[PDB]
Design a protein around this ligand. Structure first.
Ligand SMILES: [Mg+2]
Ligand SMILES: [Mg+2]
Ligand SMILES: [Mg+2]
Ligand SMILES: [Mg+2]
Ligand SMILES: [Mg+2]
Ligand SMILES: [Mg+2]
Ligand SMILES: [Mg+2]
Ligand SMILES: [Mg+2]
Ligand SMILES: [Mg+2]
Ligand SMILES: [Mg+2]
Ligand SMILES: [Mg+2]
Ligand SMILES: [Mg+2]
Ligand SMILES: [Mg+2]
Ligand SMILES: [Mg+2]
Ligand SMILES: [Mg+2]
Ligand SMILES: [Mg+2]
Ligand SMILES: [Mg+2]
Ligand SMILES: [Mg+2]
Ligand SMILES: [Mg+2]
Ligand SMILES: [Mg+2]
Ligand SMILES: [Mg+2]
Ligand SMILES: [Mg+2]
Ligand SMILES: [Mg+2]
Ligand SMILES: [Mg+2]
Lengths: 271, 88, 117, 70, 104, 66
RNA sequence: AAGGCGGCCCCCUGGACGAAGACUGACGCUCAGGUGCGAAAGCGUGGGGAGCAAACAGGAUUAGAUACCCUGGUAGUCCACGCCGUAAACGAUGUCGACUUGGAGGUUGUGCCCUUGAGGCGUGGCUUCCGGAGCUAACGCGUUAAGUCGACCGCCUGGGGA
C-alpha cells in the first residue's frame, strides 16, 4: 500500500512509503544468510570501475533458490521476508522433509500456500516446471536461460515473461523489455508475476534516501573542466557539442551490442 | 436474494405462528440477513452501484419498520435489536 | 511457358478503379490489369468500360498459360462489378463460379468520419 | 453468394442470379452503410424517421384508399 | 444441485482417449456426490468451419447435476488439456434426460 | 403462423440443426421475424441458439470462411 | 431512478410483473439542508495502443482559406484506481394518488371454452399512434393529460449588462 507522508518537514513532503503489513517483523532465517561485503565500485585494482557507488546501510545476503531443484516434494510457505539485496520480497518455505529455503515471492503468494517443483507439478503461482510442460501464453518468472543453471530472467519486483510459442526444443519468450528471445524448452520457469509490483511507486523524497541505498551523487558532465569530461568547459553554460560518455562515446541513440554469439537466439530486438 | 430455507428459518424463528411472514420482526430480520450477506458482495464488487441501490432500499425499509416498532412497542424493539445485534 | 488449366479471376472493384488479377487456385498470380493501366484516367477509369478493357487486357496477358476454366471472386462495390465478368466470358472462357468475397466486419474497427460536403 | 453455373446455362442467366443473390444478402447497402462512421444520434434519428415514414404513409394510404379524386 | 449441460469438442486423433476422459469426469462427479443424467458420444463430425487448422472433431454431450466447484475444476481440465479443443458449459433450469436430436 | 407456437416448445434447442437451418439463410445470416412470422420471444431464443451453434461449429458464421 | 446498457458462457447480484392464498395492520406521500449516482470531453498515476482522430504538417480550393476536400498524423479514444460534476443531462412537461367517452397496434404474463388448429371469450403490467369532451395565446395535449382535484417541493418576475 503506498502511503503519501504528511509534510511535517521538507524531506517528508514528497515521500511515498510502500507499506506491506504481511512482512515478517523479526530477524531473518540465520542459516541462509551470509556476508555481503561492499565494494565501492572498485575492482581488484582498487580503481573505481563503475561510478556513483558507495556508502549505504550494511546488508546481509539472503541465499535464494533460483535453481529450484526440490522436485516432487511439496512445500508450504512459512513466511514472507524483506530482502535488501533485491526489489522483490522473498518467501521462507518449509519442505516436508524438513528443509527450509528462500524463494522469490510471487504476486498472490501468502503464508500457508503449497508450492511444488518438478515436471508433474500443477499450474498455480509458485510452481516451477519446464516450459515444454508449461502452456503457451502463460506468465512465468525466474526463468532459466540454460537448463539447471538457475533463473536469470524476470527476477525484479514486478516482472513476468510471456510464453508466446514453442517449436520443438525451443520456446519463444516475450521478455519484460519487449524482446522476443528463444530459450530451450527444457529450462525451468516459475509461474506468476513477481510480488512487489508497487516498488516503483515509491518516492525517496530526499537525497539521503539514496545515500541510504548507496548511490553517491552524480556530477553532470558540463559542470566540469575539459580535462575531466568532453562536455566540460565554457564561459557560462556552453554545450556546443554532441552528448557523449566521459570516454567520448555517443549516448543519445548509439547502439553498443557487439555479441555475434547470441544473435541466433534473438528473434526481434526491443523497439 | 435470500434463499428459501433461510427465509423459512427466520420466519419460524421470529414468527409467533411460523407462518406470519409479514410481522415487523420477520421483515426486519430478513432485511438484516440480506444486508449482512451483501457486505461481502459489495466488499468485492464496489462498482455495483445498481445493486447497492437495492441495498440502500433495504436499509431504509428496515429503518422505517424499526421506527414503527419503536413507537408501537418499545420492549419488542429492544429485544429485536439485542437479538439481531443492531446498533440502533 | 507453363500451361495451367483452371484459374481464378480476382476482381477488386473500387469506386475509383477496378483491378483484375488472374491467378491459379493457389493464389500464385498469373497476370493483372487495371482500368488506369488501360489508358484511362480520373473520370474515365471509374467506368464499367474501363473494367471490361482491363479484363480484356488481363485475358490477353494470361493467353499463353492456356486457361480454359475460370472461377470469379468479386470484391468491392463498383461499376465494373458486372461488365468485367461479361468480358471475361466474351474472351471465350467457360465461367465456373461467381463468388462474392467482400469483407464485412462484425462491427469491428471504426470507419473514418463523414465527408462534410 | 457462391454461385455455380449450372450445366448448359447461359451466362446472363447466371449473372442475373448472382445480382439477385447479392441484392438478397444486402452487400452494397452494407458497404455504403459502413463507408463512414454514423453517430448513434444520427442512427436513432434515421430509424425514427423511417418508422414515422412507414406509419404516416400506412395511415395515409389506408385513408386515401377511401375517398375519391373526381 | 446445479444442472449443467456440458459439451466438449475433442481433437479427433485423441478419439481413443475419449472414454478414459469420460470415465474420469464421471468419477469426478460421482466422487463429488454428483448425479449424471445424460451422456452422449456423438462421434467424429465434420465441422462447419476449420478450428485449429483442422476440419473434424469428436463431440461429447453430458447432462449433469453437480456442484459448481467441481465443474469449475472440470473447466480448468478442459482449459489445460490440449486434446480437448472447445468446451461449453451451459446452465440449465432442470435435469434433461431425453436423447438429443443428433444422437438419433 | 409461428411454428414454435404451434408445436409448443418451452425452449429452442441449439442442437436442432435442421430447424436452425430452416431459419438461417445461405450466407449464415439470421432470417428476420418479418419473413417467417416468428413470435419475437422465440426469435430471441432462436438467435441465442444459433450463436451457440456457431460457437460449436455446428452452423457457419458465414458461407465464405474456411 | 436517470445517465445509460447490444456476440456467447459462467460466478455474484439488484429490480419489475403475474397467479392464488396466507400475514403485519396506516407502518404512508413529499422533502430545504444533506448524502449518493451522474454521457462525452478533460485531469492525475500506472499500463496499453490496431483503427479513428483534435492539434500539427504538406497538398489543393480561393481574392485570401489559420476552413470545408485530400494524404498523413499526436494527445485522446481502451484498461485499473481516483478527481471533475457538467450537456438541447429533453417528454424542453417535478413526484405521489384519485376520477373522466373511444379506436388500431406492439410487448409481457395469466384464467376459462370441447386448444374439436396457430383459435373463441376475458383479466393484469408496460408501451406506440390517432383522436372526443375538456383545456390552451395558438401550435397542440388528450385515461401514459398540457382535462378535473388533493399533498409536498423546486423555480419565474421586461431585454441587455450577466
Ligand atoms: Mg551513476
Ligand atoms: Mg540523477
Ligand atoms: Mg548532478
Ligand atoms: Mg567550473
Ligand atoms: Mg577532450
Ligand atoms: Mg553565455
Ligand atoms: Mg550557441
Ligand atoms: Mg424483496
Ligand atoms: Mg477518405
Ligand atoms: Mg387482522
Ligand atoms: Mg436537495
Ligand atoms: Mg471519458
Ligand atoms: Mg487519462
Ligand atoms: Mg496515459
Ligand atoms: Mg499509435
Ligand atoms: Mg483529416
Ligand atoms: Mg444545467
Ligand atoms: Mg430526449
Ligand atoms: Mg430542464
Ligand atoms: Mg422522493
Ligand atoms: Mg392526440
Ligand atoms: Mg388547470
Ligand atoms: Mg396534470
Ligand atoms: Mg402549459
Amino acid at each position: 500500500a503506498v502511503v503519501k507522508c504528511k509534510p511535517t518537514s521538507p524531506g517528508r513532503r514528497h515521500v511515498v512509503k510502500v507499506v506491506n503489513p504481511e512482512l515478517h517483523k523479526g530477524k531473518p532465517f540465520a542459516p541462509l544468510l551470509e556476508k555481503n561485503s561492499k565494494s565501492g565500485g572498485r575492482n581488484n585494482n582498487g580503481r573505481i570501475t563503475t561510478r556513483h557507488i558507495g556508502g549505504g546501510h550494511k546488508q546481509a545476503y539472503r541465499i535464494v533458490d533460483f535453481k529450484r531443484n526440490k522436485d516432487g516434494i511439496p512445500a508450504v510457505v512459512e513466511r514472507l521476508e524483506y530482502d535488501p539485496n533485491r526489489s522483490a520480497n522473498i518467501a521462507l518455505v518449509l519442505y516436508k522433509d524438513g528443509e527450509r529455503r528462500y524463494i522469490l515471492a510471487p504476486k498472490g503468494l501468502k503464508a500457508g500456500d503449497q508450492i511444488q517443483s518438478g515436471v508433474d507439478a500443477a499450474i498455480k503461482p509458485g510452481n516451477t516446471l519446464p516450459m515444454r510442460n508449461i502452456p503457451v501464453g502463460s506468465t512465468v518468472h525466474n526463468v532459466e536461460m540454460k537448463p539447471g543453471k538457475g533463473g536469470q530472467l524476470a527476477r525484479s519486483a514486478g516482472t513476468y515473461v510471456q510464453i508466446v510459442a514453442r517449436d520443438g526444443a525451443y520456446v519463444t519468450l516475450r521478455l519484460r523489455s519487449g524482446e522476443m528471445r528463444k530459450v530451450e524448452a527444457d529450462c525451468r520457469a516459475t509461474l506468476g508475476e513477481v510480488g512487489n509490483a508497487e516498488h516503483m511507486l515509491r518516492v525517496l523524497g530526499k537525497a539521503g534516501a539514496a545515500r541510504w541505498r548507496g548511490v553517491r551523487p552524480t556530477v553532470r558532465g558540463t559542470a566540469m573542466n575539459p580535462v575531466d569530461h568532453p562536455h566540460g568547459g565554457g564561459e557560462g553554460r556552453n554545450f556546443g557539442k554532441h552528448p557523449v560518455t566521459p570516454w567520448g562515446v555517443q549516448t543519445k541513440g548509439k547502439k553498443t551490442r557487439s555479441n555475434k554469439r547470441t544473435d541466433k537466439f534473438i528473434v526481434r530486438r526491443r523497439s | 436474494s435470500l434463499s428459501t430455507e433461510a427465509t423459512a428459518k427466520i420466519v419460524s424463528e421470529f414468527g409467533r405462528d411460523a407462518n406470519d411472514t409479514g410481522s415487523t420482526e420477520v421483515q426486519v430480520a430478513l432485511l438484516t440477513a440480506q444486508i449482512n450477506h451483501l457486505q461481502g458482495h459489495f466488499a468485492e464488487h464496489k462498482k455495483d452501484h445498481h445493486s447497492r441501490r437495492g441495498l440502500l432500499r433495504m436499509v431504509s425499509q428496515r429503518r422505517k419498520l424499526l421506527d414503527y416498532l419503536k413507537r408501537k412497542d418499545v420492549a419488542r424493539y429492544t429485544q429485536l435489536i439485542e437479538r439481531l445485534g443492531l446498533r440502533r | 511457358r507453363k500451361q495451367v488449366s483452371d484459374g481464378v479471376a480476382h476482381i477488386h472493384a473500387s469506386f475509383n478503379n477496378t483491378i483484375v488479377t488472374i491467378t491459379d487456385r493457389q493464389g500464385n498470380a498469373l497476370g493483372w490489369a487495371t482500368a488506369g493501366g488501360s489508358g484511362f484516367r480520373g473520370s474515365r477509369k471509374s467506368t464499367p468500360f474501363a473494367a471490361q478493357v482491363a479484363a480484356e487486357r488481363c485475358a490477353d496477358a494470361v493467353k499463353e498459360y492456356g486457361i480454359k476454366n475460370l472461377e470469379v471472386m468479386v470484391k468491392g462495390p463498383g461499376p465494373g462489378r458486372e461488365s468485367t465478368i461479361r468480358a471475361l466470358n466474351a474472351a471465350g472462357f467457360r465461367i465456373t463460379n461467381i463468388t462474392d468475397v467482400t469483407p464485412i466486419p462484425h462491427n469491428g474497427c471504426r470507419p473514418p468520419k463523414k465527408r462534410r460536403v | 453468394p457462391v454461385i455455380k453455373v449450372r450445366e448448359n446455362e447461359p451466362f446472363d442467366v447466371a449473372l442475373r442470379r448472382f445480382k439477385r443473390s447479392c441484392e438478397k444478402a444486402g452487400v452494397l447497402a452494407e458497404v455504403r452503410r459502413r463507408e463512414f462512421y454514423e453517430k448513434p444520434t444520427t442512427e436513432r434519428k434515421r430509424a425514427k424517421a423511417s418508422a414515422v415514414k412507414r406509419h404516416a404513409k400506412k395511415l395515409a394510404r389506408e385513408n386515401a384508399r377511401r375517398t375519391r379524386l373526381y | 444441485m446445479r444442472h449443467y449441460e456440458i459439451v466438449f469438442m475433442v481433437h479427433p486423433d485423441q478419439s481413443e482417449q475419449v472414454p478414459g476422459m469420460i470415465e474420469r469426469y464421471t468419477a469426478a462427479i460421482t466422487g463429488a456426490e454428483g448425479k449424471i443424467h445424460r451422456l452422449e458420444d456423438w462421434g467424429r463430425r465434420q465441422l462447419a468451419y476449420p478450428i485449429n487448422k483442422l476440419h473434424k472433431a469428436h463431440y461429447v454431450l453430458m447432462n449433469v447435476e453437480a456442484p459448481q466447484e467441481v465443474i469449475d475444476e472440470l473447466e480448468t481440465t478442459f482449459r489445460f488439456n490440449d486434446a480437448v479443443i472447445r468446451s461449453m458449459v451451459m446452465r440449465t433450469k432442470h435435469a434433461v434426460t431425453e436423447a438429443s436430436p443428433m444422437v438419433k | 403462423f409461428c411454428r414454435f407456437t404451434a408445436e409448443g416448445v418451452q425452449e429452442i434447442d441449439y442442437k436442432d440443426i435442421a430447424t436452425l437451418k430452416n431459419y438461417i439463410t445461405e450466407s449464415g445470416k439470421i432470417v428476420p421475424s418479418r419473413i417467417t412470422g416468428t413470435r419475437a420471444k422465440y426469435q430471441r431464443q432462436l438467435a441465442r441458439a444459433i450463436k451457440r451453434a456457431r460457437y460449436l461449429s455446428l452452423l457457419p458464421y458465414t458461407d465464405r470462411h474456411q
